[PDB]
Amino acid sequence: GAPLTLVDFFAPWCGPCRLVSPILEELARDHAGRLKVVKVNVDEHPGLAARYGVRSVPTLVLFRRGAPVATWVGASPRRVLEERLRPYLEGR
Template identity: 50%
Template sequence: MSDAKEVTDSSFEADVLNASKPVMVDFWAEWCGPCRKLSPILDDIASEHADKIDVVKLNVDDNPATAAKYGITSIPAVYVFQDGEVAATSIGAKPKQVLEQEFAQFL
């Protein structure tokens, strides 16, 4: 479905919280239509801005502990983590230009 790296409850700390550069996390689920629509947009952002930010995906159905920890109640939810903390959030499927504006400081 996507080129983005899958992260899990067990790999989240190493892959996201301890990352040396900002990480954009796509909280998604297989059954979520808007999530499927957002996926290629995030793939584009990942390839265009790979030098500045990593983009990963976390399936909320398969990894409920991380989703619960960050209060994910609506998907798709895109969070940017920097230095182990949530630095920015975006809820819902949005056009690429809107996401790039919302996360401009990280791209």
């Protein structure tokens, strides 16, 4: 399968981001062979956030072959995130 990288755009002053980040790390750990998770502090790298259209946090962007294939805005429960990622994890 093509490698997948989930980028977690967050800010230190964001409450919901606090919820999501450990869920994402658990996910990466649980699907280590197929999924890499990287956190990007939007206040540390605003140009990067702008390059990928991040206008609020948390924003999760899934990359395949070095380009975004999906972007989800806002925090969501573990179950919801698992299900969004599953088709990509089970796909080519």
